[PDB]
Structure 1
Amino acid sequence: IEEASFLNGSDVVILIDGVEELYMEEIKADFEQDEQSIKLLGCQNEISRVGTTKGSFSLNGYKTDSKFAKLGFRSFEIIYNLSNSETLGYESIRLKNCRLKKLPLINSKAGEIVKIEVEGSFRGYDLLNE
């Protein structure tokens, strides 16, 4: 019903190691189970339990510097804020111990704008606001 509840991608600000990142196209982050399946002798359905949690992120954008190449495989943090405009509420998520799986050293095509895409893993998250 309420039009105002929907949140657009334009209400997004990303901070990589405390400095705002402006030239990003999309971002993803998931906190995934290693779900443990259990089968019992007296019971005829599988029982699922929570396993170890791992974080995975991807982060696609437009290249304007060699920030990620300098950044290397050092650990960093990602603070992601998604705000509402019609309402004043906002969500803020801090991904901790983020680390790149691979360095986007070179990615260019003949007549397109140079884009940068990275992926990696993070240990845990803090839901700062909501």
Structure 2
Amino acid sequence: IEEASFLNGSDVVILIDGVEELYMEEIKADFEQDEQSIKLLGCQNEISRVGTTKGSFSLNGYKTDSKFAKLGFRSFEIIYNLSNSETLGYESIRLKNCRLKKLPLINSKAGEIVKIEVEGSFRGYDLLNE
């Protein structure tokens, strides 16, 4: 019975703006696009087109510094190395011109560990490796 593999999520390594960020817990990023649905005058099947693209991302992790608060709305890059060790074919993706949607200055509850949640957008992406 031949083997398989699940890319465990704990293999993620995120380098935000060059420096390796090591408290991040979950990262999401999608490349949206407006469908631009057009109804033809003779054909009864709607047609979709690329339209224009839009990035969106997010990160959650344990707070350890004011890195994001001091960063402000400055543009920055994000790398995401989804390493695979059962098979050594890691995957690396670069997000270009990441900008925060909202600066998370303060978020904390008394009886809990303080976590930092971020969300924003990016102009474009590059698939460095796969």
Shorter-chain TM band: over 0.9
- Distance across 2 between alignment mates of 1:86 and 1:41: 54
Partners in 2 of 1:2 and 1:36 — Cα distance? 44
Alignment deviations for residues 54-113 of structure 1 (CA, whole Å, 9 cap, x no partner):
000011111000000110000000000001111111100000000001011000001100
Give 1:92's aligned residue: 92
For the residue of structure 1 that corresponds to 2:106, the secondary structure is strand
Q: 1:42 to 1:121 in 2, by over 3 A?
A: same
Q: Deviations over 1:25-71 (max 9, x none)?
A: 10000000111101011111101111100000011111000000110
* Alignment partners' CA distance in 2, 1:2 and 1:105: 50
CA RMSD of aligned residues (A): 1.2
- Provide structure 2 residue ranges, at least 5 long, that are not aligned to the other structure: none
Percent identical residues: 100
User: CA shift at 1:4, angstroms?
Assistant: 3.9
Which ranges in structure 1 are unaligned for 5 or more consecutive residues?
none
Structure 1 residue 6: Cα displacement:
1.2
Alignment partner of 2:4: what SS? helix
Any conservation in 2 of the 1:4–1:87 contact (CA below 8 Å)? no
Partner-residue secondary structure (3-state), 2:57: strand
Bigger proportion of residues as strand: 1
Per-residue deviation, 1:2: 5.8
Tell me the matched-pair count. Answer: 130
Is the 1:56–1:119 Cα contact (8 Å) retained in structure 2? yes
Task: Tell me the SS of whatever aligns to 1:127.
Answer: strand
Tell me: CA distance 1:36–1:108, structure 2 relative to 1, closer, same or farther (3 Å).
same
Counterpart Cα distance in 1 of 2:76 and 2:90: 23
* Paired residue secondary structure (1:99): strand
